[PDB]
Structure 1
C-alpha cells in the first residue's frame, strides 16, 4: 500500500498549528512563514499560545515546545456578523525551526487556480471517549460560487469560498475551525463557518478565500 495513499494517511502534517488559550485547544491554524501562523479572525482570544509539529494534544497540554504569540493582527475589515474577511495573522515569539516535523504551507496566489480536489485538517477526538485531540483529515471538493450562493442566500461574499462532498466529508470528519483547506498542495482556505469542517454538496462548508489576502499578508509580514 506504499504511496497508494494520500494526505489523510500521513502521520504528520508539518504546517498544522494548534492554538491554545487558558489551557484549552481553541482552534487550528497554518504555519505560512517561520514567524507567522494564519488562522480565522473568529479565533481571536487573549494570550494565545501556539503548538507546532504536534500530533496529539491534551487540555492543559504539558508537552511544552510551545510558542507564545506576541502580536495578533486581525484583518481590519473583519465583520463578525457575516464572518466576511475571517482571517488573522499571529506573530510567534521566536522563528519556527523548520524540520521534518515543521514546515510552512505556500499560499495559493491565483484565485483562478483550477485544482478542486482538496483536503481539510482540524483538531478533534477520533471517537467518543476522552482520548487526546489529534489531527482529523478529510477529503472534499470545491463547489462553484453560484452553487455556494444558492446554499447560503445573501451570505456569501467574494472573500469566501465553499467546499464539501456528497459523502458528507470523509468518514472521519471531526475537527475544529481555523485550520486549512489545502488544494494542489497550497493553502486555499481557512475553515470559517457553515456546515464545517466537512459540508455536503448542498450544505457546504464555508472557508475564507485566502487567495484574496496575499497582498495584505505580505504587507503585514514585511512591515
Structure 2
C-alpha cells in the first residue's frame, strides 16, 4: 500500500496473509471458517495462511496450512479476467475478536462509494519496502466508463476500479488478493495496477466480487 496508513488494531479481522513458507506471497480474505478468497494469480500448490494479526510474520498468530485451490475456470493468465480463487484451509479457524469472516456483498456498490483496501505490500515503488503492520488506503469506486479512459481494452466487464484523483494512495506488490471493502461488504479483490505503483490518476484494479456471487456460493457450498 502506497501512501496509506496503519490500519486500526483489529478493524480487519478478515485479513489473511498467504505465505510461501515464511514469506509474504499475497493477501486474502476470510469468508468462512474453512475458506479464504484471493486472486487467481496468487495460486500455489500450498500456502501457510496467517490469520488474526495485523503484523506480518507474527509468531503468535495462527498459521493454517492449505493445499487446495479453486480458481475461477475463466481465469486468464493473459488478460487477468476472472482473477478470483477460493482456497480451502486444512483445518477451520476459530473465530474471535481478531478473526472474523468478511460480509460478502448482496449488490454492487456504485461509483463514488467510499472504500478501504488493506495489505502488507510494499509502501514504496519501484524501490520496495515491506511493512510489519497492515496498511490501509481509502479509495473511491470509479465507473467503468471513466476507468476505460485510462486503461482502454485492458479493462474487462468484471474488473472494478478504485482510487482518488491526484493521489498516489494505491495498492502495490504484495497487496494482491486482499480485500476492498465498501459499506461493510467485500466489493473487490486486489488484481493489478500500473507500475511503478502509486501514480496519480492510475486507478487500482480489482476483481468485482459482486459479479461472482453464484460461483463463490457454488464452490463453497457444503450441502447442496
TM-score (norm 1): 0.85
Most deviating of 198-207 and 32-41: 198-207
Give 1:219's aligned residue.
218
SS in 2 for 1:90: strand
Deviation per CA, 1:158-204, whole angstroms, max 9, x where unpaired? 11010001242449988622101110010000010124897666310
Structure 2: distance between partners of 1:57 and 1:95: 20
CA contact (8 A) 1:140 1:198 kept: no
Change (3 A) 1:208 1:129: closer
Deviation per CA, 1:18-40, whole angstroms, max 9, x where unpaired? 00113211011000111100000
- Residue 46 of structure 1, CA deviation: 2.2
Give 1:205's aligned residue.
204
- Residue 150 of structure 1, CA deviation: 1.2
Structure 1: distance between partners of 2:162 and 2:170: 16
Give 1:82's aligned residue.
79
Give 1:36's aligned residue.
35
Structure 1: distance between partners of 2:195 and 2:139: 11
For the pair 1:72 / 2:45, whether they are aligned, the reply is no
Give 1:4's aligned residue.
none
List gaps (5 residues or longer) in structure 1.
Answer: 1-6
Structure 2: distance between partners of 1:115 and 1:202: 15
Q: Could you say which structure has the greater relative contact order, defined with CA pairs below 8 angstroms and 6 or more residues apart? A: 2
SS in 2 for 1:82: coil
CA contact (8 A) 2:24 2:174 kept: no
Alignment size in residue pairs: 215
Change (3 A) 1:198 1:35: farther
Structure 1: distance between partners of 2:40 and 2:114: 25
Give 1:116's aligned residue.
113
CA contact (8 A) 1:136 1:172 kept: no
Give 2:8's aligned residue.
10
Deviation per CA, 1:78-112, whole angstroms, max 9, x where unpaired? 00110000000011111111111000111112125
SS in 2 for 1:182: strand
CA contact (8 A) 2:31 2:104 kept: yes
Structure 1: distance between partners of 2:94 and 2:196: 29
Give 1:3's aligned residue.
none
What RMSD over aligned residues (CA atoms) do the two structures have, in Å? 2.8
Structure 1: distance between partners of 2:212 and 2:92: 22
SS in 2 for 1:161: strand
Structure 1: distance between partners of 2:130 and 2:188: 28
CA contact (8 A) 1:159 1:208 kept: yes
Give 2:96's aligned residue.
99
SS in 2 for 1:153: helix
Most deviating of 126-135 and 154-163: 126-135
Most deviating of 39-48 and 64-73: 64-73
